[PDB]
Structures are given as C-alpha cells and as structure tokens.
Ligand binder design. Sequence first.
Ligand SMILES: Nc1ncnc2c1ncn2[C@H]1C[C@H](O)[C@@H](COP(=O)(O)OP(=O)(O)OP(=O)(O)O)O1
Ligand SMILES: [Mg+2]
Ligand SMILES: [Mg+2]
Lengths: 554, 413
Amino acid sequence: PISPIETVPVKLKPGMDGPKVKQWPLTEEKIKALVEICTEMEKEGKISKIGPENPYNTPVFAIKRKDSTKWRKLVDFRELNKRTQDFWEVQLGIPHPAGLKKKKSVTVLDVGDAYFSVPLDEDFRKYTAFTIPSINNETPGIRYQYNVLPQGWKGSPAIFQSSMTKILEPFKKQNPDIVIYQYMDDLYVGSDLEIGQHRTKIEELRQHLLRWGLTTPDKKHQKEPPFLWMGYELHPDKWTVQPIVLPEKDSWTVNDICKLVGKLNWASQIYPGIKVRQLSKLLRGTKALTEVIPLTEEAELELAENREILKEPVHGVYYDPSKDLIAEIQKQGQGQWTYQIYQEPFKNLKTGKYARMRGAHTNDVKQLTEAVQKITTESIVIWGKTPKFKLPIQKETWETWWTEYWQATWIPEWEFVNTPPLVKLWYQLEKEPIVGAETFYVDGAANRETKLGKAGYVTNKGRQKVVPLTNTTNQKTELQAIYLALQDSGLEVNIVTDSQYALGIIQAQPDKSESELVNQIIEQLIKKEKVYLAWVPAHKGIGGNEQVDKLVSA
Amino acid sequence: SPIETVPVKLKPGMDGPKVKQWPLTEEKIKALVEICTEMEKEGKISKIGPENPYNTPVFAIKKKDSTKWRKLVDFRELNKRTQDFWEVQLGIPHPAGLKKKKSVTVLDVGDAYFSVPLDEDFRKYTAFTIPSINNETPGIRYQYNVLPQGWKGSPAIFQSSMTKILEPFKKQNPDIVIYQYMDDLYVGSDLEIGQHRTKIEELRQHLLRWGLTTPGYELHPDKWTVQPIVLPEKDSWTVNDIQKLVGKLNWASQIYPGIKVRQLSKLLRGTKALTEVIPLTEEAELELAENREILKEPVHGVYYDPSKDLIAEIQKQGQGQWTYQIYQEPFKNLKTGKYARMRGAHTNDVKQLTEAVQKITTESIVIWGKTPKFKLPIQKETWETWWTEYWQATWIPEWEFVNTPPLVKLWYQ
DNA sequence: TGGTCGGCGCCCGAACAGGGACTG
DNA sequence: CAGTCCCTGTTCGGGCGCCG
Ligand SMILES: Nc1ncnc2c1ncn2[C@H]1C[C@H](O)[C@@H](COP(=O)(O)OP(=O)(O)OP(=O)(O)O)O1
Ligand SMILES: [Mg+2]
Ligand SMILES: [Mg+2]
C-alpha cells in the first residue's frame, strides 16, 4: 500500500502560486484508462477528490509500456516545477555492470507502483490538482490531487531515491554483508551466501520493504540468470548490452542521425571501436529534425563499418579487485581513439572511445593525454581505482614532450605497447640556431576595414619575397608568411618573428589544426630536417626586423 | 540553555553554494564516510535530504604520515557568497611582524570549531554530498550543526573566545606574534630549534587543557631572497644571443621604467646571420654591467593594497623549475621566487605544481594575511584529475587555468 | 494526433571570457 | 587612455541515447 515513511518538506518558489492551466483534450482511449486508474488510485487513497475550494489545476495524460497492458499516468507539471522550489539531485551517476564484483548469489527486484507508495507532504498536495475529463464531453470533469509522489513532478525523483535509501538504511545496517545496487526503485541484491541462505535473506529484505509499504511483485529475477538489469544481461560470469537494434533506412532525417549516434554511443561501451566522427560531423549545419540531410562517403562507410561490428556478438566481464585494473588505448586516426579496460587479456570489463578534439591547435600526444584523463576519471567513477596503462607512444616520445612542454602534463603508471599506429611527435624544433642556414626575417599585415594585406621575408644572404594576401587578418598573415619560408627554403632554415601568435602555435609542435593553412605549415615542417624559430620585439627597430615591416607595411 | 549561535547571512541577492560533488576513491570514500559516521554520532553533522538545494564538494587527505585521513571541503564557492560577514564587519589586523620571525610554526587547531554551535538558520548551506563507487547508492547528504572547518566565519566568530584563550601565554610571551588563518594557527618567534621547538610544545599543554587539540615543519619565508631577473653571463655574443637578451629586456623594462635599450639595440640594423659572432663596444658592454644593477635593485610601484585580490603567475622551466609571480597589478610584482624538487624521489609535473601552489600560498598568507588567485599553467582536466591527490593544505586557494607561450618564462629562467 | 520528470553520456550551436594586435 | 578587431578558450543550453 502507501508508506509510513516520513513525508518530505517542499515549499514553493518565494512569492509564487500554484498551476492553473486547463486540460487539453485526450483520446476516448486514454480517458478510459485514466478513469480506470484513478478509480483504483483513489480507492487506494493515492489521490483524494477535490471541489471548488481548490483554485489550481494542471493537465495529465497516459502512456503504454513495453508489451504491457499497463499504462503510466503522467502529469504535465511543467508549470508547477517552474514555480516549485528546487532540490539537490541525489542521483550522482549510474551503476555499470563492469563495476559489479562477482557474487555467489544475485537477485533483482522492482518495487511496484513505486512513486505512488511514497507520501507527498500534506501541505503541497494542494497544487498537484488536476482534472480527468469525461468522454461524452458532457459531465464536468472529476478532480483530484495526489497524496503520493506524482509522476512527473520536478521533485519526485530525488525524493523517492532519498525515501528509498532511508527505508533500506536499517536492513543494510543489520546486513552489512549484502550488496544492494539501488537505482530509483530497481533493487539488485548481491550476496555471497549459498542459494539457501541467500534466498532467505532476500525474503527478509522483501518483507521488510513491504512492511514499509514497498511491494516487490513477482517480476523479481530469481534463478533468472541472465538477469535483466540497467539495460544489460547479467550472466554468471559475463554481461552484455541488451539487443541494440539500429535503424535500417533509405532517406535520413536529422534526429534520425541523432538516434543513430546515440545508440552507437550506447554500443561503444562494449562493442569495441565504434566510430562516429563522420556521422556527427554530418550534423553541424543545425536545422530541422524533420529535414532530410544527405549521407556522405566518409559517413556512409563509418555507418556500415560499425553496423558490422554490431553483428558479431560481444560481451564483458565483471570486476576482480584482487587483480590489477588495466586499460590500453589505440589510435583510430583523424583525432578519434578507442580503448578497453581488462584485468585478464582478452577478457575485458568495458570498452570505449574518445572523439573530442579539444582545441584548434593540438597534436596526438595532447589528444592522448586528453584521453588518459577521460579514462581515469571514468575509471574512478566505476572502480574507485585508477588503471595502469599500456600506450602506443614510445617511452621516450613522452620523456620528450613533457620535459619539453611548457605545461605540467602528467600520466600515471604506464608501460609501452608496440602496436601501430604508434604515436610520436611528427617533428622537432631546433632550440639552437642552425649554422650555415639562410637566416630569414619574416612578417606581414593587412588592413582593418579594407580587403587585403600581405606578408614576406628577407634572408641574411640576400633574398627578397612578398605576397598579396586577400581577406587576411593580423594573424592569417604572420603564419601565411612562415608557410613560404619553408618551401622557399631547404633541409636547414632559420626563421624569426616579432609575433608570438604564430610562435606558440608552432611551439607546441601541433600536427593537426582546423585551419588548412596551419596543416600546410606543419606538413612542410615535417619535411625539413632542422628548423629554428626565435622571437624579438615588434616595432622596436631590431636588425633585419624593420626591413620586413616596410616591405609589407605598404 | 544560554549559548550564543551568532546569526549570519549571505550577501544581498546571493543564493547558496550549489556545486556538484566530484568522483572520489575507494580509500577516500571509506574514510570520508567512516568520518561523517562519527561526526554525526556527535551532532556535528546531520543527514539531510533533496529538499536542501545547497551543496559543496568534499573529500579527504591523509597527512603528515599520521596515516590518518582528515576531512576537508571546498567552501571556496561559499566563502565567496558568505557575505562580508568576514570582510567589512570582522576583518583581520595584519600582523606584518611575522615576516621577520626567525622560525614560525604552523599548527591546525580548527578542530576546536566543532564545539561552537552554528546558526541553524544558516546550517542549510554547509550541506555536502558523499558519493558511492560505481554509483551503487545515491548521494548520502549531511549538514553542519557546529562550526565547519575551512570556512570564512568559522574562524572569525571563534577568534573572540580564541584571543581570550591566548591571554595566559600571549601575555607571558608577548614577544611572539600569534596569527590564525582559517583553521591553522601561526606562532612565529626567533628562538633556536632546541628551545623554540620545545616551547610550541608548551603552547600545546596550554591549548589542550583549554580545549583545543592537534596531532622541516617550520618556516622562515623572509629567510629566503626572491631570485631577481638574472641576465646571461657570456664572453662572445651571436646574432640571436643578442636579439634574445634584447627582446627580454624590452619587457623586463616595464618592471623597471629605467632600463637601457639603444646601446644594445644598435649592434644590429641589418639582416645578419644568427650564427655570426659580433661582440660589443664599451657603451653596450657597460650596459651589460649597468642594466645588470637594476636587477639587484628592488622594483618600485609595489603597494600592498588589501582592497584588491592577490594574484599570481607560475612557470614550468626544467627539473623542478617553477617561478613565483606574486603581484596585485600589471608588472607590479610585490614579490617573486622559485621552487625546485628537493634531492629526494623525483616526483612529477602536477604533484609538484601543487606543492608549488601550496608553498607559494603558505607564504602569501604570512607575508600578507591572505591567499592568491593563481593563474595556472596546467590543463583544467588534468589539474582537477590529480590535484586532490597531493595536497595537505587544510585550505583551498582560488584559481584559474591559463596557457601562454614561454620566452616570457626566460625572464625568470 | 501530441504531450512529464530526474540521472549520466555524446555531439552541436550559441553566449559568454581574456589576451594579443591595432585604431581614435 | 579609450574604442576596436582578430584569436583562443570557456560556459551553457539544446537533441538524442541509456536507466528508473
Ligand atoms: N517515463 C517516466 N516518466 C516519469 N517517471 C518515470 C518514468 N519511468 C519511470 N519513472 C519513475 C516513476 C515511477 O514510479 C518510478 C518507477 O517506475 P517503474 O519501476 O518502471 O514502474 P512502477 O514502480 O511506477 O509500477 P510497476 O512495478 O507496475 O512497473 O520511476
Ligand atoms: Mg516498478
Ligand atoms: Mg610583425
């Protein structure tokens, strides 16, 4: 029935009143069910009728469920919520099979009519006012109000969750040895007792709950391995995501692409190496989620590729704390990366990806460390431990990039894994002028309101060049210029600048940028076997400096 | 029951701290909880629900090889919102005399605050949420009934009864300067390590039998000179070797409006080869021994204006090479310094950058009576990932993240 | 016909934010 | 001094996915 648990205190937003929106007509179908529910609901005291003394009202509707004769009754509390005080959500994250420890005995329970078992506070009840229409569109609707957490109220969640934890508080306290993964009203009891004694504790827990008003109907996974839990399938020694069907279609709308990426993103936790870049890319031109969008080659493939991976069944294992937690990662190219965590080779716990290109001027070692974090954070969220690593980047390419970078980048205990495509800095930058090397003096500029500008260089061995740039900017110049001082130079060069914009960009040895021009500088940079690049103040009349200004300042 | 829970309020038009709690460790949660367990059993904290929309991040850090964890909270976002109850109403008189102390000793004692019932109508902000591994259970919340360590008013309100607990040893030894910051207390004197140390141990028998309790430890920040902006010391100069010490002194100039440019700006006026050696004249050679004196002469324009926030900047150089930019305004470097990994087990970037954010602040608090606003060189993700690992500062300095090319690091190199 | 809530993730767009460089 | 651009980051909201 309805629970004796302590009700929860909720007020409204300072100086704000209740909802007063009408009920937008519903099918002759839903009404039929709403009237079939409230009948019982009110009969069970979950809702009390009301009369004229209740000034407020908000709409409601119904929903069918996964192969269920049952309907879910919802209330469009959008307004109320706005006017309702706000709580601190207690649901921090989500449990993950891979974080489950192997247990001798498992059970799964789903509290019945969950919300409707938790009492809404006596004072607030007044706003949950609603109206259930008539079919003959004659008799004025019947009105009621909830006496239990309403389905769709901004607060129900954190309250239920909270209410629940307190209800189990005593059992867990007197049964420290039974793990109980709880999510909303979904209970997963893990025990290390024998079927005998476990099934016995499982009843205790059940009765306890019912005694507190929480019914645990037979929709309780028993000797049900495989258990269905949080969208997975829990087997004695492995687990797997439930049938995850992708949409086979011809012409693709935008949300369609959205459903794909979402799902594949769901897949990406166990089927390894799903890739999405070229499909997400396919969604930059923000438009109508009913608007037909074309499919690209890079996309078309990325689709079918993954679509294949999803054919071969895959699965993951559980966690063993008495054994190191490993994670390895590999490059999938073009800024994407895939990875998995295991403890026993080939029997991994979870898989994943990292396709976020943080920045406009970074390289792989930046994007690799960018991923090592993703994995640690996440990893701690799941095992509250941080994995040892196996990385496709030479034990030195690192002792280089870090002792050489200006920022304090760090990577945990890690080993090397010779498994191409390895990750290595595509080139270096001489930190000492190159003797017997044509010393260029580069620079340029363009004009504010006017169209063009320009840039050029000058050698110490005598050589002059400059080019007429169009639509460029203070930056699109300095760089556009250092681009030629490479092709127009050999294995060994020596460029200098009074700018820092282009100095730092090339000071990170970036090998990937959003600006094609930049890639062109790197591209060339890789080709030369020695290149130095120092800096000297601008417009402070320095040797070989001024000449360049003028040659371009025009 | 005549007690006195001092009433307090947040600034005008300022909600409370609503900051999401972040991932912890098995070891960290196991203690962080084992703590709050006792802490509730002794009414310092009390479980609370969802209906309290206020939250502050929390965590723990074992310390000093007490191999005992201490609970801590990032009240930063609160202290910022907790009105000037700590500013314009109960400021702190700068005991500038601590800069001179031969040997100062720091000792956390805020552990006394938990005997000072806090305004209940205010407790609703001290709400912190503890999480669980793999999200087995939802956030276990709590509130504060007594005084929350690591808060603005937490020390301010207590200081009154504090000073009065001091009179017996603070008047029979007025020679020493005693300062209290957040939770830690500072006792700077001049005595030798044989004596001076044996006394801090007396100030214990005084404070433990007066309530309070507490489980190289000393400091002499002034006993360490800020390394000036040193220049190169060669006997042959190349085209770049010159253009470099040139562009360096071009910026190391706004720190000294009086620093010579032209004599070394003259050595080049044509597109010359970087390798090429071209030593100098006697004027530009006297400029090397001249603009080399301005670098032993303390900068001028440095006024410690308590009206503004102490800012700082840091630099990654090489082998535990980090440098102090403690300043309140552009080029107005109140004091600068460094920090090198000691001759011990060589640690990593972040591990140190953190001590090198803690060390630099330990002083900022003694030499000024407050904390900086660090402009950090690391990446957000990175910092936030491991920073909590290597920290024993019972407080948390405000901070930001910043990436900017070097050659500006040279000037401190 | 359609429509609710909270948690987390991914991606995208927009609105900020701070430097550096120039113009008035 | 300002008022500006360039540029680089951040933050935030939105949609879809998964769970209840
Ligand atoms: N679509 C939804 N909208 C709002 N709340 C939901 C939704 N789905 C689930 N909830 C919340 C409210 C529910 O009371 C609670 C549990 O739902 P659920 O366990 O799936 O069925 P139920 O506990 O309401 O009755 P039953 O045991 O017959 O399935 O979770
Ligand atoms: Mg249910
Ligand atoms: Mg220039």
